Amino acid sequence: MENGYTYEDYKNTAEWLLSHTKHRPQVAIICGSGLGGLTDKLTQAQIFDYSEIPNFPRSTVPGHAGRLVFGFLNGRACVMMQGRFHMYEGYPLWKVTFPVRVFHLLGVDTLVVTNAAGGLNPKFEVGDIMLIRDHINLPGFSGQNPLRGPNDERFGDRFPAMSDAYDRTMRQRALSTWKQMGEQRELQEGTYVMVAGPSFETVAECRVLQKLGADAVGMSTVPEVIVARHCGLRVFGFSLITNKVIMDYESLEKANHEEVLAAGKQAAQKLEQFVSILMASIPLPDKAS
Amino acid sequence: MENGYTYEDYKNTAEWLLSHTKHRPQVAIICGSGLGGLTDKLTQAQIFDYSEIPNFPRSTVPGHAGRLVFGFLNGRACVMMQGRFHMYEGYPLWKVTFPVRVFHLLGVDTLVVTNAAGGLNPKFEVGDIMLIRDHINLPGFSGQNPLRGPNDERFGDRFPAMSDAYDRTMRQRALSTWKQMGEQRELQEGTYVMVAGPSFETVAECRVLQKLGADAVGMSTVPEVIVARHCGLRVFGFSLITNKVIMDYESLEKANHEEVLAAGKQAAQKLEQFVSILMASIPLPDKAS
Amino acid sequence: MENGYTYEDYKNTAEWLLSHTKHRPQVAIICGSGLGGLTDKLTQAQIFDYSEIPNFPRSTVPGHAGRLVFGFLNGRACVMMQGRFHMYEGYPLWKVTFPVRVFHLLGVDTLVVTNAAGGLNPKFEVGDIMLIRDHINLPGFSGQNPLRGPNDERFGDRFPAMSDAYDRTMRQRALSTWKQMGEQRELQEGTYVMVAGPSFETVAECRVLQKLGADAVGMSTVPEVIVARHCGLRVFGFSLITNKVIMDYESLEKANHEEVLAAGKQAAQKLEQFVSILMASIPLPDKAS
Numbered sequence A, B, C: 001m002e003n004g005y006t007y008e009d010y011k012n013t014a015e016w017l018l019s020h021t022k023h024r025p026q027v028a029i030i031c032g033s034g035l036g037g038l039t040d041k042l043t044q045a046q047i048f049d050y051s052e053i054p055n056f057p058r059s060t061v062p063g064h065a066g067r068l069v070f071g072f073l074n075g076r077a078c079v080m081m082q083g084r085f086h087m088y089e090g091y092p093l094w095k096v097t098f099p100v101r102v103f104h105l106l107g108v109d110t111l112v113v114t115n116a117a118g119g120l121n122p123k124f125e126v127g128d129i130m131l132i133r134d135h136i137n138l139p140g141f142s143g144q145n146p147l148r149g150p151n152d153e154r155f156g157d158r159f160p161a162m163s164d165a166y167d168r169t170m171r172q173r174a175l176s177t178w179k180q181m182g183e184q185r186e187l188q189e190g191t192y193v194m195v196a197g198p199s200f201e202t203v204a205e206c207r208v209l210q211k212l213g214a215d216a217v218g219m220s221t222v223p224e225v226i227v228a229r230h231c232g233l234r235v236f237g238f239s240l241i242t243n244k245v246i247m248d249y250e251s252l253e254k255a256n257h258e259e260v261l262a263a264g265k266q267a268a269q270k271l272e273q274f275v276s277i278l279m280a281s282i283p284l285p286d287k288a289s
Ligand SMILES: Nc1nc2[nH]cnc2c(=O)[nH]1
Pocket: A116, A117, A118, A119, A195, A200, A201, A217, A218, A219, A242, A243, A244, A255
């Protein structure tokens, strides 16, 4: 089905934003379920609710705190999308991913995407942090892909390969940094799988996902990632683990979202220090820097 | 995408039904492809075609026999949805699942769902009966979920866990009963996987489903189940097996739907006795019973 | 969701075509990404752009060369759909598959479908040719199936089995022929899996597909095949392999579509000789031939 948004539509929204803030972003950060904390630390903050920005999808119902704060963070200047969009919310996939495209028109040349995810690996302990190395997009195998439709050769190719989705150096540079702060627990790596559904995962299901080779399940990021790469954005991101089951031979836990708690603890504080430091290793342009 | 139905819409339909029958249901039974027999045995029968009930989706084309019979069965009073709704019929998932939600507004506190399913396990012999213990919902991994949209906090949470979908005691109580009737073949248990498609399963496909860990394939129940649990309905159900292939090294059968026959035999008679007796172990409320 | 097309709609389009060309097709060939060459070799050629044919979906944007050429090839008379329709193009599945249904109304009793596919098996070497023996349709597990809706009992059953999708003799007859031309490399066989998405496959993903048991991945054919069989069309086809990755432990290739090249070489010339000869083993009717 078409992409309602019309190139002119992303143009008008890039220019407008670009004409209301004297900040020319370089990095776009997308924070998820208990990582809006990463906001505060911006320095020359400048906030625009998703409501003024002309074509931006207004955020539905939650804690509502969903705005787009512009600022400078640890040397590089960036954009912070605080409270993103998911499928389970009823959004066509070209709506959730509108953010990522205006960004590309903004100047941005890096896209770091966080998200509070599952944890389907026995080695991970709630609270950890997983360096997304790859993804398994199940909603994409079926036709639900943000690129499904005619293509705007102004943005990217028709058949972009995702083989190298998440940058390599940025991931070594992150891998290093972790060492470099003298940190207790190690920042892991694995592959992430997007499940779309609002409800949580059956023990029966949690075993296919493990079987398929995923490491942490979730309901976001794969779209924004896919359309970033389409643009030649340099992507890469972390996943903050918070749980998961595997036993029906009999258990007696479940896994709520009340547990925005897990992230709503020091998983937050940590993931902030960790991305503030990382700003310092993102190749800046200028005239070769 | 929105859920057309508006809470007021399920309200009007609960009240109307609740004002046309002097029966206050406690259990809702949903019968599938050759289990409408379970109807007859109701005692103080009262039938409403899906056509009078104001917002109820009218049943498309088949043997047409799709009505909602109210009655009393073996001690408990119940609702019998005779001939349900599936995806392959062209129904948004919020249409098939309208039944389950009016029920919850009716008073009902248990939801037993039958369905004539595949059989992907070598140990099962056509005619058996599988006690659904869990599910693998593939149409849910992609975005096709009945909860996909804004959420009516009047019904349930936003992120319900399905970890414990199908009740435990009810399943021990069923497991026992089978013994308790002195029965020839044993009532099995395994996990059920919903495939949406009207056409049947390739031998190539039948091996992923086995690989993924399913025990019996089918085209229904997972939606009604998921939205039951959302409500705090107590769910649980059986699957009446009737076939399946696994060999392309060369075979020469196929599997029709003509075979509404399998169920359209003593798989029916059996699954009736078996759910009539089971009515006797469903905790009733009153004022603690 | 309904099938917009109304039987009368496929009727009008069959009759019109049937009244503009003095050719009564027997075989329908569908060629994909670099196999339109197979066109030239028709002998009593007769071309109709997808644009005149009244209800035919007009082909979107590409090299545009998307017309339907009627002719006689190697003894049998056929229809050649040059440049098909895919999901990633934004087409409801009942649009891509309109071709296959008018054909069935044309008289056609065989449907050979080519398609330039992946290659997920280590034994295959780019350039090969895979005799599609079976399929794994992932977009069908989720609800995206061309038969999803009311059913026109004029065409086929409601629950067609696909157990025997791709004909057996035709596949032995093809298997033989390969020998019979004294050919260097052997024409393989394996099972094909349809991924819908325009973007290409993650290394993470490429391993589920291998795991699931596929041999060559792609973004087409499964729909046209499924609806052919529904009609009792005799289907069968080849896949021309052209690539694939499996290593993220670190590699450094990707896989473009620029590589319409692979097919846009002697994979084309070969796949032409090979289907021209095969015309000679397709049982013709007449009055028993
Ligand atoms: N899909 C999914 N998303 C989550 N977000 C937080 N926990 C989970 C989980 O267990 N599954």
